[PDB]
């Protein structure tokens, strides 16, 4: 949404206020592995 | 011609001046309808 | 009535004011010749 702003033509403003509903604000990412029955030395590695 | 010019550069900016207050009255509401929506949230936290 | 078409609109009124201003430099530039001729007139009549 656009507030002209200036003397000439195409000066302006943005407000893009995000959506706030309660089905779009909290959304987290659980994860849980198998039942692991190997042993061993591990070394996780997240990427990005 | 440069009067004119400059009047309406003038009376532009005036009315840029209200569309401004009314870009800040609409942000504060937001902003400030935002407040009750974070202890809301809180109170949901130290219920769960 | 609406965001893009005031923009323009603007941009409009503005060429108007421009070829409002050229024309009525073209009045004026015709009336300051005339007063000239009317004044030289004036004092060749008398002469005469």
Sequence with gaps: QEFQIGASSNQTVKATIGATQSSKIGVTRFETGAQSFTSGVVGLTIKN | ?48 | ?48
Excluded: P
């Design chain 2, 1 to 48: 011609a440069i009067a004119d010019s400059l009047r309406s550069q003038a009376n532009t900016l005036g009315q840029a001046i209200s569309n401004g207050n009314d870009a800040l009255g609409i942000l504060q509401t937001a902003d400030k309808a935002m407040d009750e929506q974070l202890k809301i949230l809180d109170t949901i936290k130290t219920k769960a």
């Design chain 3, 1 to 48: 009535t609406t965001l893009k078409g005031a923009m323009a609109v603007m941009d409009i009124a503005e060429t108007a004011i421009t070829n409002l201003d050229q024309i009525r430099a073209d009045i004026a530039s015709i009336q300051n010749q005339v007063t000239s001729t009317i004044n030289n007139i004036t004092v060749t009549q008398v002469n005469v």
